[PDB]
Structure formats: C-alpha cells, structure tokens
Design a protein around this ligand. Structure first.
Ligand SMILES: Nc1nc2c(ncn2[C@@H]2O[C@H](CO)[C@@H](O)[C@H]2OP(=O)(O)O)c(=O)[nH]1
Ligand SMILES: [Ca+2]
Ligand SMILES: [Ca+2]
Length: 104
C-alpha cells in the first residue's frame, strides 16, 4: 500500500524521507539545482493546514524512486520546514494551472 498517493504515483515514507534529506542538505548548504532552483521557499498560497511551523521549502520527489538532481521536476513535491520536519506531500496533478493539491 502507498503511504502517499499523488495522482497515479505511489510513495512510501522511505521515498519521502530520502527526497527530503537531499533537499534539506542542499538548503543547509545554500545550494540549488534545476532551472526552477530547488529547493526554494513554498509560500502556501493554497492555504494547506500544515501542522508544523514555517518557513516551508518545496523539493521535487520523483516517481522513479530517484533523487532529483536538476532535470524535469515532475508534478510532486515534498514540503519541509527549517527544523527538518515534513510539512506535507503535494502535487500539481489534478490541480488547475500551477496550483497544488495534497497527496492522499
Ligand atoms: N502554487 C504555488 N506556487 C508556489 C508557492 N510558493 C511558491 N510557489 C511558486 O510561485 C510560482 C507560481 O505558482 C511558481 O514559481 C511556484 O514555484 P514552483 O513552480 O517551483 O512550485 C505556493 O504556495 N503555491
Ligand atoms: Ca518507491
Ligand atoms: Ca533507480
């Protein structure tokens, strides 16, 4: 079973932990990858009810199981905060334009 389902994508907690660890490390070292410069601040325009404190940062999580390194980011994102706490897993899949909806 999936711990997180983003559209047709199935993720386990380990997938998210691995993605988050890579994103958080880049954030701490003040480095970014990809033309869209990940990881970067997530403003929460959507108004999701995150249970952890801000600031929030978004980092791509890939369906292939591979850690994002600069190519096409896809539709799914792991959102973490300054204390390395997972805020949530979101996706553009099933959402209009560049909006996000939460993964179930
Ligand atoms: N939809 C959305 N985009 C955000 C948010 N925070 C930052 N962004 C960025 O604002 C712009 C319009 O959505 C994009 O550059 C998007 O970045 P990403 O495209 O890298 O997610 C947010 O809370 N919601
Ligand atoms: Ca997996
Ligand atoms: Ca692989």
């Amino acid at each position: 079973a999936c711990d997180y389902t983003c559209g047709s994508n199935c993720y386990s907690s380990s997938d998210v932990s691995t993605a988050q660890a890579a994103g958080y490390k880049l954030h701490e070292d003040g480095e970014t990858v990809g033309s869209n410069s990940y990881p970067h601040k997530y403003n929460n325009y959507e108004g999701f009810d995150f249970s952890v404190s801000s600031p929030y940062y978004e980092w791509p999580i890939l369906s292939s199981g591979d850690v994002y390194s600069g190519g096409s980011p896809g539709a799914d994102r792991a959102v973490f905060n300054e204390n390395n706490q997972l805020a949530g897993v979101i996706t553009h899949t099933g959402a209009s334009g560049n909006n996000f909806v939460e993964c179930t």
